[PDB]
């Protein structure tokens, strides 16, 4: 009775209804990599990051390095997204290799909390800046529909780690 | 047992795993609206469209207006995406308001198949062209990463309908 | 007798009159560099009127023009903007390809890039802008002009011939 | 003997040497129109303006309405160009459809001197903002290699005329 299309369709419906609250509607989603240098071990390893955008919130979810699972998750209201900075990666040595985007957010009435992300670039000689500008512009345009401005600022990224990230529902 | 946070994270990883085939990775996804005049009824109601991009394919899902679920679903290999056109909407009379994005694809080795999409915008004084240029750009580099090319063309859009779309897994 | 100023204004008047035919208005002009390999930067002057565009190549060691073309906007088929068709490794910068009909034949094109001071600068925005003026100028006078973003082909244009 | 192409070649050569000082190289040039109410001849028309850019200077020339003749000529050093404002034309009433470009220059250590220009080309449909943005971006990129930075502000333009312009060599 039920066809492949009907099954994959019903799966899509159910999962838009499970991921987001009833009042929220999907706008955009991007696969990204964590750009902040972590304080763990030597071997350089890409941390997958998922950024999802609705009409009223943006979602940041971090993936475990080796296995397929989510280590850290956050639903963040758009009003608390203060500013976006886009510029050369804050490496601890060498020339910056690519661009990263830093999303600065308000948490428990405080600043110093930020996510620094870059796009998955399969071409080594590709900057990645265009992709991040596009993402920032959609975050901006969406926040503006709520009635609030969001500055997108081009500048060199400060080599600093943002206040410990806590999980948020 | 598991916390509220643990369940949400689990649902998320499971979703991203089910959404695409084993070998594919998610790159990006966007909520859009069908831009071409559809021939069931000639009225004023937006047809919602979901566009997903993997490393090897893009996915187009049309939603029923009455209910929040699919009416049509297509997985389309990136090899078959011929070109993208971006210009003013093909209005049957008078001034075109917004820009639309036309994705020309090859189906059963035949051409003349296309999706015409636009962005959902909360500012009537914004043509949405930048949002569409961004999406086209990600489709372009993704295809360039797999070895081929994808022309993005700025021109006027022609006042013709696409060949009927068929569901494809 | 005339002043320094009066002479300067008269020179400018005379120049804009001499630059183009009686029935043409100047719209825009840009200093560019040849992007294609030749069979040392070659300076290129591109000029735009209401009905035509002008391409003039400069010799590499002397201040002189050695190739000059007036091309009607109706003969400009399409514009391609994308990374330079290099013969080695990574393309440094974007180039703009102006495809034109010459005596009812295709395969003729100029590949040009912007004069860019900062080495960490693509120069794509500058070229997008030039193409946008060529587009609207042609559209007001005649047919539409496609601007295509893609990777440029590693082919060489059909030999350029001079047009008055 | 000398061919036609040879003659136009030496005409182009000598004249790009007569217009500019010996150490100045032509970057760009645009035909524009005065947005501001004329002060020399009060009545409303479309005063032709030529804007030329070299590596160290920009040139502004006002043509006479009836006969083609330079009524006002200014060579202005890029260092004295402090800001560029873009946005709707300054009217006394109602809706401004097209946008203008206001270049503020410092003259004899004093401010309040500006040129308000708009693009010649357009459809009544388009505001002409994109063109002026491109010009602004060439003036910015040129001055910056040479000197101090140049901000481009998007804002409403008062229609406040700018201190009487004096001819400069």
Layout of strands and helices, then pairs:
Four copies of one chain form a homotetramer.
Chain A: H1 4-19, E1 26-34, E2 48-54, E3 57-63, E4 70-77, E5 81-88, E6 99-105, E7 113-119, H2 129-145, E8 152-154
Parallel strand pairs in A: 5-8
Antiparallel strand pairs in A: 1-2, 1-7, 2-3, 3-4, 5-6, 6-7
Domain hSac2 (chain C): 2-164
Subcellular location (chain C): Membrane, Clathrin-coated pit; Early endosome; Recycling endosome
Subunit structure (chain C): Homodimer. Interacts with OCRL and RAB5A. Interacts with INPP5B and INPP4A. Interacts with STAT3; the interaction is independent of STAT3 'Tyr-705' phosphorylation status.
Q: Secondary-structure element order of chain A, as H and E?
A: HEEEEEEEHE
Sheet-strand content of chain A, in percent, reads 25-35%
Q: What proportion of the residues of chain A is helical, as a percent range?
A: 10-25%
Cα end-to-end separation of chain A: 38 Å
What is the molecular shape of chain A? globular
Biggest beta sheet attributes of chain A: 8 strands, mixed
Chain pair forming the biggest interface: A-B, 42 and 41 residues
């Amino acid at each position: 009775s039920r066809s492949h299309q009907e099954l994959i369709s019903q799966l899509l419906q159910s999962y838009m209804k499970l991921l987001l609250p009833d009042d929220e509607k999907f706008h955009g989603g991007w696969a990204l990599i964590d750009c902040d240098p972590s304080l763990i071990d030597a071997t350089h390893r890409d941390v997958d990051v998922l950024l999802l955008l609705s009409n009223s919130a943006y979602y940041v979810a971090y993936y475990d390095d080796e296995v397929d699972k989510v280590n850290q998750y956050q639903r963040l209201s758009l009003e608390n997204l203060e500013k976006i900075e886009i510029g050369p990666e804050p490496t601890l040595f060498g020339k910056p290799k690519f661009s990263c985007m830093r999303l600065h957010y308000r948490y428990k009435e405080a600043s110093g909390y930020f996510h620094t992300l870059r796009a998955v670039m399969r071409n080594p000689e590709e900057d990645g800046k265009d992709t991040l500008q596009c993402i920032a512009e959609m975050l901006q345009i969406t926040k503006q529909a709520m009635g609030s401005d969001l500055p997108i600022i081009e500048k060199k990224l400060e080599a600093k780690a943002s206040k410990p990230h806590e999980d948020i529902i």
